[PDB]
Amino acid sequence: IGTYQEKRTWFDDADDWLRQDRFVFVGWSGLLLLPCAYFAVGGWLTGCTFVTSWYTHGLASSYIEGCNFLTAAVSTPANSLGHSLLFVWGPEAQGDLTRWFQLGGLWAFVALHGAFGLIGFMLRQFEIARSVNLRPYNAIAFSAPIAVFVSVFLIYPLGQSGWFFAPSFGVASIFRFILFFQGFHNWTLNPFHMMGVAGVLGAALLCAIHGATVENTLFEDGDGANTFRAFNPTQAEETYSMVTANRFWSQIFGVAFSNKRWLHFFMLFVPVTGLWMSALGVVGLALNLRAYDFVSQEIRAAEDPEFETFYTKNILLNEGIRAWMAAQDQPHEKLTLPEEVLPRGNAL
Amino acid sequence: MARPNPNKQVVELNRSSLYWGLLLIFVLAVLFSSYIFN
Amino acid sequence: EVNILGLTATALFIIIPTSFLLILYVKTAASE
């Protein structure tokens, strides 16, 4: 602190203990990251194994009932609970553990602990980058998964009727959530989701192209047929030919990278921007503010009985998803619909 | 610290950044014009 | 009968940033 006397307190000793190189780094962020992440993963692996979903959703979502890894899940609470935090000490559980389970309390447990574990993990990235004196672009990149998690598991159910409409922690549960967004929200038609899809696809694109190009312009740096032993971290020369890579992609694609800084910053930029746009889209969908329709197309189809498009086909499919899914999907909504009022085509 | 400002800087925008900005603007217009016209 | 509010929005969103970027590029290339 500017070569001051700096008399040692407990904070210096705990600081020295926490920022110490070990098998696993703890730090100050480990006071939050390690317990929160451990409890979130343990709660998910416990709910997928033992905790039932019969009371809340009326289904089976655990290994003890006959579900697979692709089938069991930590299910959300009932919509009747609303946006209740569902503490084990709360007015609903009332100190009961075996009935804090089977009420959706474990979902809120896993969600809150996962959110605070994500906070602790970005804090851990910040702390390790400060310890090694490196820029926290890892934390800047991790800001986008945290944004996706917040907007999806917190902001969307907080805008909807309750945690019931949040995605349950699983595989088939997430696929339910995805098909629910297809039928009820038309999430494919949302331009923010289109930007997110473009970001993820371009990020996988950049990963594959960069890996293939670097591994195909490797120089010799040795005599053996295996180039992996050729890499030596001691030498200061670059392990691949940027000039050759630039000429190859210039004559193949038309444009090519000339700066390693710009190439790696673009690899950083594309998925983070895509996930942030998708997060903004899910924020929009939290309040049912949807890119569901094209008004000109609907009016033209209403006044024109032979005009149809793939958009109209998509809307017709979304109606079928909603009507055929809601009755067995939302038990609080109590749809005793006859199958002669549901939209059904010919034969099928 | 004097009559001129020592904090004065200029803006540099090369042709790659110009192409990226024009491409971003036109692609955003392509994506969002269908929704603005609706 | 023309969605001229959407036309104005699209035309302005094209014109203003393109002109801004072109002015920046011209003043950058004029003084190296």
Partner: peptide
């Protein structure tokens, strides 16, 4: 107009990528 704006935007994007391919700055430093 409706389709004219879409055609204008698409051909503007195509002209931008054509200029980026052919009339780019020459690649310096590697």
């Amino acid at each position: 107009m409706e389709a004219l704006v879409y055609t204008f935007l698409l051909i503007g994007t195509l002209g931008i990528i054509f200029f980026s391919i052919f009339f780019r700055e020459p690649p310096r430093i590697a």
